[PDB]
Each structure stands twice: as structure tokens, then as C-alpha cells.
């Protein structure tokens, strides 16, 4: 598909590979479900830019690993620090703030997607941070974890991705797909 060719020429190959591994691990093929292929690559790159944000070895990346290794690291963090075991796999863990983080990249209002995630988690301790393709963000307790400059790069990157899809007339079908 055209979306697949764009995703592959838009994101770096390591990111594309982790999304491919993660989709086939859950029975989905990137060549058919090309919109979900785009969304996993975006979500992946955001998590890695996020993890790059802040100090050194600050975030233990949970997303991008296979399920059983990801839960292995979560169980170790839980028995290490003593925090509650979340019901759903998060994306990061903040060693500085001592909390798991769920990262979301949406095509709706940050309030709606935050509400969906906050009610589905129902763990209270897991921190939530939502980005949108228009530069908007919402985070638990208005605590945005990272500095402004790091968050602004993610927002800028998201909007750069949005324009690239639109130039290829793919942005409309992509938002009408989440
Ligand atoms: C050189 C640099 C590359 C990026 C790479 C890094 C992503 C992340 C990748 C993998 C680790 C790889 N695997 C495979 C299985 C076992 C395993 O461990 N996974 C997935 C699960 C968690 C994790 O770690 N990695 C690799 C090194 C450390 C790291 O976090 N990051 C982080 C920022 C955005 C990004 O892409 N790095 C490395 C550090 C700085 C940086 O940017 N380049 C080249 C030019 C463009 C670019 O970014
Ligand atoms: N089909 C599966 N493909 C890969 N990974 C999958 C997967 N099912 C489960 N996981 C791993 C655990 N879920 C997440 O980590 C996660 N989930 C969600 C939502 C909410 C409910 C399911 N979901 C979803 O699957 O699409 C989003 C998505 C996007 C990119 C990468 C993964 C997932 N939004 C997250 O921001 C997020 O990080
Ligand atoms: Mn995840
Ligand atoms: Mn997430």
C-alpha cells in the first residue's frame, strides 16, 4: 500500500522493525492494517524520544520489547521498588518519580483520549501522558514529567508526520481510522 511505503520511508528502520514484530506478534499484518502500522510507529518513536528526554538511564523502556520480557522487567521494577503491579502493560517507568507511564498518541481531543485511558487503567498509580497530532498535550496532575523543550520536539515531530501524510492524501483516512 501507499501508507506502508510512506511509513517505511518516514520512520527509521529500527522503529519500523519493532512495529512489525509487535503487530505480527498479535496476528496483524502491517501490509494490510497500514493505518495501525503508522500508529504503532508513531507511538514507538514518541516513547523513544520521551525516554531520551530527561537525564541518563532515567526511564526503563517497557514498550518495544516482547510481551513476556516486558512483563519480566515490570515484575522486577515492582519487586524492586514496591509499587503496585499494573493491570496493563505501560510504556515507561520513571526512576526519578517512581511511577509507570502510559504514553498515548491520539487523533482526537486530548480530553477524550485521556478519559478513555484513565478509566481503562483504573490503577491510580500509573501516570498518563497524552499527545495529539496538533501540538496539544494532557498529563496526570498537570505533571508533565519532562521539560518543555523535550515535549515541544515530540509535538513538532507529530505535526511533521501529519503534514507528510496529508501531502500524500493519507491523513484524512488515518484520523478516520483510530
Ligand atoms: C544510534 C541512535 C539510535 C537510538 C536508539 C534508541 C532506541 C532503543 C532501541 C531498542 C534497543 C535495541 N534492542 C533490540 C532488542 C534488544 C535491545 O536492546 N529498544 C527497544 C526496547 C527498549 C530499547 O532500548 N535504544 C537503543 C540504544 C539505547 C536505546 O534506548 N532511541 C532513543 C532515542 C530515540 C531512539 O531511537 N539512540 C540510542 C541512544 C540515543 C538514541 O537516539 N540513532 C542513530 C541516528 C538516529 C538515532 O536515534
Ligand atoms: N494489538 C497490539 N499491538 C501492539 N502492542 C499491543 C497490542 N495489544 C497490546 N499491546 C501491548 C500493550 N498495549 C500498549 O502498550 C498500548 N495500547 C494502547 C491501546 C489501548 C488498548 C490497546 N491499544 C492498542 O493496541 O493500540 C495502540 C498501540 C499503539 C502502538 C503500540 C501498541 C499499542 N495504546 C497505547 O499507547 C499503548 O502503549
Ligand atoms: Mn505500550
Ligand atoms: Mn502507550
Residues listed for the chain: 178
Determine the Cα–Cα distance for residues 167 and 146; give it in Å rounded to an integer: 31
CA-closest residue to ligand 1 atom 46? 12
Question: Is the minimum distance from the CB of 18 to ligand 2 under 6 angstroms?
Answer: no
Q: Report the atom number in ligand 1 closest to the C-alpha of 65.
A: 21
Chain Cα centroid distance, residue 78: 21
Neighbouring residues of 155: CB distance < 8 A, sequence distance ≥ 6: 131, 135, 136, 137
Q: CA 148, CA 114: separation in Å to the nearest integer? A: 20
The residues annotated with a catalytic role in the active site are 63, 91, 117
Name the packing angle between helices 13-24 and 2-10 (round to 10°).
130
Q: Got the DSSP string for the chain?
A: -HHHHHHHHHS-HHHHHHHHHHHHTTT--TTTSHHHHHHHHHHHHHHHHHHHSSSTT-EEE-TTS-HHHHHHHHHHHHHHH-----SS--SEEETTTTEEEEEEEESS-HHHHHHHHHHHH--SSSEEEEEETTS-EEEGGG--SS-HHHHHHHHHHHHHHHHHHHHTT-HHHHHTT-
- Cα–Cα distance measured from residue 162 to residue 176, given in angstroms and rounded to the nearest whole number: 13
Please give the Cα distance from 95 to 70 (Å, whole number).
Answer: 16
Cα dihedral sign for 142, 147, 152, 158?
Answer: negative
Q: What does the angle CA 64 – CA 91 – CA 45 come to, to the nearest 5 degrees?
A: 55
40 CB within 6 A, ligand 2: yes
Experimental approach was: X-ray
Question: For atom 39 of ligand 1, which residue has the closest CA?
Answer: 52
Beta-carbon count within 10 A of 94 CB: 16
Report which of 161, 178, 147 is spatially closest to residue 41, judged by C-alpha positions.
161
- Residue 53 Cα, ligand 3 centroid: separation in angstroms? 17
CB of residue 48 inside a 6 A radius of ligand 1: yes
Cell of 113: 483520549
Ligand 1 pocket, residue 104 CB under 6 Å: no
Resolution for the entry shown, Å = 2.8
- Please check whether residue 131 is in contact with residue 46, taking contact to mean a CB–CB distance below 8 angstroms: yes
Task: Please tell me whether 43 is known to bind a ligand.
Answer: yes
Place of cell 517505511: 8
Amino acid at each position: 500500500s501507499h501508507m506502508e511505503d510512506f511509513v517505511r520511508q518516514c520512520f527509521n528502520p529500527m522503529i519500523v522493525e519493532l512495529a512489525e514484530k509487535a503487530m505480527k506478534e498479535y496476528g496483524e499484518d502491517p501490509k494490510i492494517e497500514t493505518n495501525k502500522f503508522a500508529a504503532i510507529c508513531t507511538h514507538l518513536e514518541v516513547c523513544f524520544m520521551y525516554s531520551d528526554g530527561g537525564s541518563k538511564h532515567r526511564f526503563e523502556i517497557i514498550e518495544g520489547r516482547d510481551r513476556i520480557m516486558a512483563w519480566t522487567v515490570v515484575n522486577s521494577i515492582c519487586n524492586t521498588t514496591g509499587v503496585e503491579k499494573p493491570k496493563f502493560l505501560p510504556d515507561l517507568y520513571d526512576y526519578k518519580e517512581n511511577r509507570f507511564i502510559e504514553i498515548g498518541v491520539t487523533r482526537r481531543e486530548v480530553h477524550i483520549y485521556y478519559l478513555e485511558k484513565a478509566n481503562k487503567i483504573k490503577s491510580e498509580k500509573t501516570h498518563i501522558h497524552i499527545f495529539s497530532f496538533t501540538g496539544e498535550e494532557m498529563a496526570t496532575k498537570a505533571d508533565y514529567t519532562l521539560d518543555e523543550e523535550s515535549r515541544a520536539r515530540i509535538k513538532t515531530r507529530l505535526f511533521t508526520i501529519r503534514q507528510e501524510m496529508a501531502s500524500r492524501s493519507l491523513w484524512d483516512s488515518f484520523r478516520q481510522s483510530e
